[PDB]
């Protein structure tokens, strides 16, 4: 299966690259009629069969790809793009490593997902299913990670689903900022990361190094310790300002975000997020107060209460001071979904709904079959669970949240989405420049670290961020299950129309944040990102409402 | 421990100041009563010292004082920034080399606690080599570019830790393999893997669909971790190279860092692997030079009488096709001294004779006390063992060999050096401009790539390489045991004098290669190296002691 898989993974990636770059208007595909297209580059022509969806984005059949008689390889296409994107020799070598890092991961997913139907795939352990997700749907090399070779990818990247222990440091209390809140204490957090047996071994070394209550334990991602801290802070280690204790405790598993880890040894309700310096103190310390505010909003607001939306909090955070110390040394503790989940509930990332099995059966169809609901009622439930809370939060409180497939978690019970769980706010949270009374409750500590922008800036966080970057990849799979894209977005508009009817006192707010303008504003093609005039395209919400 | 952090910094400052004063970067002004002062921009260094016969200071580190500031190597390095015209990036480079050296010195201080000079010479030969102080000339003799605390502790010799090798598979057609004689790959593999591992290795070999068209290539784990897994990720992703993983015996690093000893099973074959930290004809043709010197030492009677041994390289390999592949992927198998030692003989590096125990008791004195010999006869033996063979090789055959403490092994028997074993000299060797008939026998494959030199400059390889870089650090320990430096070098001259008197047919050769000229030339060093134009002429101790 060596040669067969290598060709399949290269074809899938070439098709992903061509389709997204054509949607970004880097080049324009010419119709050859009969569902056949060609895309012309300098010194090469790509021919294939495709169908153009409601967003203007091509659904390319990877098996039909032809480049004359050259073998279909992503490496070949990348070299053909050097003149198109005006890349230096070094910029190409960087993308090669990101390119080959992606093919390696895609080969792993192909091997690990073999013989598994969509029904099989949705029955995996939630943490294993998350590991097997294809990754970010927009970026060409979505598993490239600067400086990570085959060893680091396999040990720490999620698509390999390997586990590892954390490295532990000791730091003087006067050197660290600690924002732990509520009933949590260091001993509790340590108990979440170490079983009583490892905590004793940890304490033994703690006393063997002559440390006392003036020092605090700091966990460190082993890659961060291996590549950055053991070297960049070697002076602090030799002088004694910091002490390296070694690896202790439970085994951890990487999520799609790579920096946030799930405990695989003991399901304890707290995830951990650690620095990974691949490519400050105020922003990291305000999150615990931003979560506390959004939690109060979702509890009070009836519309958000009724949607079931959950705000996963950050109860504890830390970093080092006396700027490099702050970004590279620190820890954040996050609330695991299992704290808020019912016994029969299971979490999935919404990106799961973009997946298909070996035989191109969408996983979303597997959920629908198990729900016993017809597709239309199932989609309506999904839209009321996901889009209504986010749009209501924006129009009422002037608050925008990044709504991607990898930071939206769905609670699933017997194939139905029960409610949404949100977890990422910090650098991803934005506010409206307008002064809404409903925003007066926000602490200044958060206002100063969060960007405030005009309404048209914030729509994209929901149009581009959720509709273009998530729904664009779900509606084609529904079209394959008997729900055309036109109908798909009719249901979304109806959920949004019904919702706005129910809040006539916000008539003006909805005009200020309209999702039904005939066009959507584009993001300029400023340096085309391949790794994790006034131009506009047609809005499916407006297009599907017209006779 | 504050006490140890002060000791290591004081010892390092003294080494830096003395060696830089000898290099005439600055001059120590005598203040009388054995007290010296060294003036730098913005700081003065005062201390007591005794200047030796080479003009190199012996500094009492306890007497170090620099105005108010605490004696730290970090402080001195910043004070040298203007003196050596170092950029901010070069300084940060040397800081990591500096603290990496202090870390190693801290380890050596721990592991050598409570151990007398007699105790030290009783240690296993491999452990004793690990506990050596390192290179005596360079300020930061344990700095290795890119190596942090983790990398140092796992693979550097001063920590004495062991590790398994990584193993790759490469196609025969992409490899130059020059195994010779009876040796085969199966033999070499059996030297690196016990039966249970050889079988677990062969399973992974088959699991990757490999056959006799591929060859195993061992790789240093740091080399795999940091360089190959990333730089050659394209080759791994495409299948030109296959990563098999770690297998086999545990290996221990030598002073050269790249050459390793088998610590699990003594097999008599050391391995030398690439470490790309800072073209193929050099690495490849040298073994024909070792085989040639082996023939010279067996033929020549003077060298047969000395017992000098040339350690061979019976197998070597590197990759070619698709430069980088040659330097970064390859292996050299070296003969271990034990293949040529007698049961009653133990090996030590000659650098061992520069060491003292905690109480400043020289280890060279311990070797003497066991020998039952007076110091003077012991030294005569050492000089006959080490200097005579190297000097004879030069005068008769026009061949000069690097002769520093780290590449000179001594065969020790009841405290007495019997003979010398020579190892790493693929690129430290030099030949004379003249055409000597005794040299016609040298393979042109060697002659073309090893640098040619004139006689006057060909001495410095022997004077600077051995006398100034080795004996300069041994004669001070003898003076502390009742053998003044003047006498020390009187004995060396007598051995040479007695030797030359026995070969009067070389009188002209000795004139061209005279070690008794009253002065030594010193090559200017505008680029002063801190990690492992002219200066005023230097007095030749061999001429001084003859007066």
PDB file of C-alpha atoms in Angstrom, chain A residues 6 73 75 96-97 100-101 103-104 107 147-153 155 167 225-227 230-232 234-235 237-239 244 247, chain B residues 5 74 95-96 99-100 102-103 106 146-152 154 166 224-226 229-231 233-234 236-238 240 243 246:
ATOM      1  CA  UNK A   6       1.456   8.106  -1.735  1.00  0.00           C
ATOM      2  CA  UNK A  73       2.647  15.573  -6.886  1.00  0.00           C
ATOM      3  CA  UNK A  75       5.855  19.184  -4.635  1.00  0.00           C
ATOM      4  CA  UNK A  96       8.547  22.110   1.267  1.00  0.00           C
ATOM      5  CA  UNK A  97       9.067  21.055   4.881  1.00  0.00           C
ATOM      6  CA  UNK A 100       6.127  17.086   3.473  1.00  0.00           C
ATOM      7  CA  UNK A 101       5.083  17.382   7.115  1.00  0.00           C
ATOM      8  CA  UNK A 103       1.913  14.442   3.555  1.00  0.00           C
ATOM      9  CA  UNK A 104       3.450  12.495   6.440  1.00  0.00           C
ATOM     10  CA  UNK A 107      -0.307   9.174   5.363  1.00  0.00           C
ATOM     11  CA  UNK A 147      11.215  23.370  13.107  1.00  0.00           C
ATOM     12  CA  UNK A 148       9.353  20.073  13.666  1.00  0.00           C
ATOM     13  CA  UNK A 149      10.960  17.092  11.956  1.00  0.00           C
ATOM     14  CA  UNK A 150       9.538  13.600  11.647  1.00  0.00           C
ATOM     15  CA  UNK A 151      10.489  12.832  15.263  1.00  0.00           C
ATOM     16  CA  UNK A 152       8.744  15.833  16.831  1.00  0.00           C
ATOM     17  CA  UNK A 153       5.675  15.428  14.610  1.00  0.00           C
ATOM     18  CA  UNK A 155       5.803  12.407  19.328  1.00  0.00           C
ATOM     19  CA  UNK A 167       8.770  18.341  32.089  1.00  0.00           C
ATOM     20  CA  UNK A 225      12.100  22.144  27.180  1.00  0.00           C
ATOM     21  CA  UNK A 226      14.083  20.141  24.626  1.00  0.00           C
ATOM     22  CA  UNK A 227      14.396  22.820  21.938  1.00  0.00           C
ATOM     23  CA  UNK A 230      17.075  24.004  28.053  1.00  0.00           C
ATOM     24  CA  UNK A 231      19.063  26.242  25.670  1.00  0.00           C
ATOM     25  CA  UNK A 232      17.621  29.771  25.670  1.00  0.00           C
ATOM     26  CA  UNK A 234      20.677  27.868  30.119  1.00  0.00           C
ATOM     27  CA  UNK A 235      22.117  30.856  31.998  1.00  0.00           C
ATOM     28  CA  UNK A 237      19.633  27.057  34.900  1.00  0.00           C
ATOM     29  CA  UNK A 238      23.366  27.304  35.637  1.00  0.00           C
ATOM     30  CA  UNK A 239      22.967  30.333  37.925  1.00  0.00           C
ATOM     31  CA  UNK A 244      15.139  21.423  36.150  1.00  0.00           C
ATOM     32  CA  UNK A 247       9.594  14.518  33.730  1.00  0.00           C
TER      33      UNK A 247
ATOM     34  CA  UNK B   5      29.282  28.195  41.882  1.00  0.00           C
ATOM     35  CA  UNK B  74      29.854  36.250  32.666  1.00  0.00           C
ATOM     36  CA  UNK B  95      27.330  33.042  26.792  1.00  0.00           C
ATOM     37  CA  UNK B  96      25.776  29.688  25.897  1.00  0.00           C
ATOM     38  CA  UNK B  99      27.357  28.462  30.849  1.00  0.00           C
ATOM     39  CA  UNK B 100      27.559  25.079  29.115  1.00  0.00           C
ATOM     40  CA  UNK B 102      30.202  25.873  33.907  1.00  0.00           C
ATOM     41  CA  UNK B 103      27.502  23.189  33.901  1.00  0.00           C
ATOM     42  CA  UNK B 106      29.822  21.551  38.114  1.00  0.00           C
ATOM     43  CA  UNK B 146      22.921  24.518  19.859  1.00  0.00           C
ATOM     44  CA  UNK B 147      23.328  22.078  22.773  1.00  0.00           C
ATOM     45  CA  UNK B 148      21.209  22.901  25.815  1.00  0.00           C
ATOM     46  CA  UNK B 149      21.216  21.336  29.259  1.00  0.00           C
ATOM     47  CA  UNK B 150      19.239  18.315  28.032  1.00  0.00           C
ATOM     48  CA  UNK B 151      21.515  17.671  25.047  1.00  0.00           C
ATOM     49  CA  UNK B 152      24.655  18.117  27.155  1.00  0.00           C
ATOM     50  CA  UNK B 154      22.496  13.017  27.536  1.00  0.00           C
ATOM     51  CA  UNK B 166      19.147   5.683  15.793  1.00  0.00           C
ATOM     52  CA  UNK B 224      18.605  12.407  14.053  1.00  0.00           C
ATOM     53  CA  UNK B 225      16.641  14.570  16.485  1.00  0.00           C
ATOM     54  CA  UNK B 226      17.931  17.975  15.385  1.00  0.00           C
ATOM     55  CA  UNK B 229      14.549  14.216  10.800  1.00  0.00           C
ATOM     56  CA  UNK B 230      14.056  17.815   9.575  1.00  0.00           C
ATOM     57  CA  UNK B 231      16.607  18.581   6.840  1.00  0.00           C
ATOM     58  CA  UNK B 233      12.198  15.146   5.714  1.00  0.00           C
ATOM     59  CA  UNK B 234      11.545  15.132   1.962  1.00  0.00           C
ATOM     60  CA  UNK B 236      11.839  10.342   4.463  1.00  0.00           C
ATOM     61  CA  UNK B 237       8.377  11.358   3.240  1.00  0.00           C
ATOM     62  CA  UNK B 238       9.084   9.982  -0.243  1.00  0.00           C
ATOM     63  CA  UNK B 240      14.301   7.313  -0.357  1.00  0.00           C
ATOM     64  CA  UNK B 243      13.638   5.744   9.738  1.00  0.00           C
ATOM     65  CA  UNK B 246      16.525   3.103  18.167  1.00  0.00           C
TER      66      UNK B 246
END
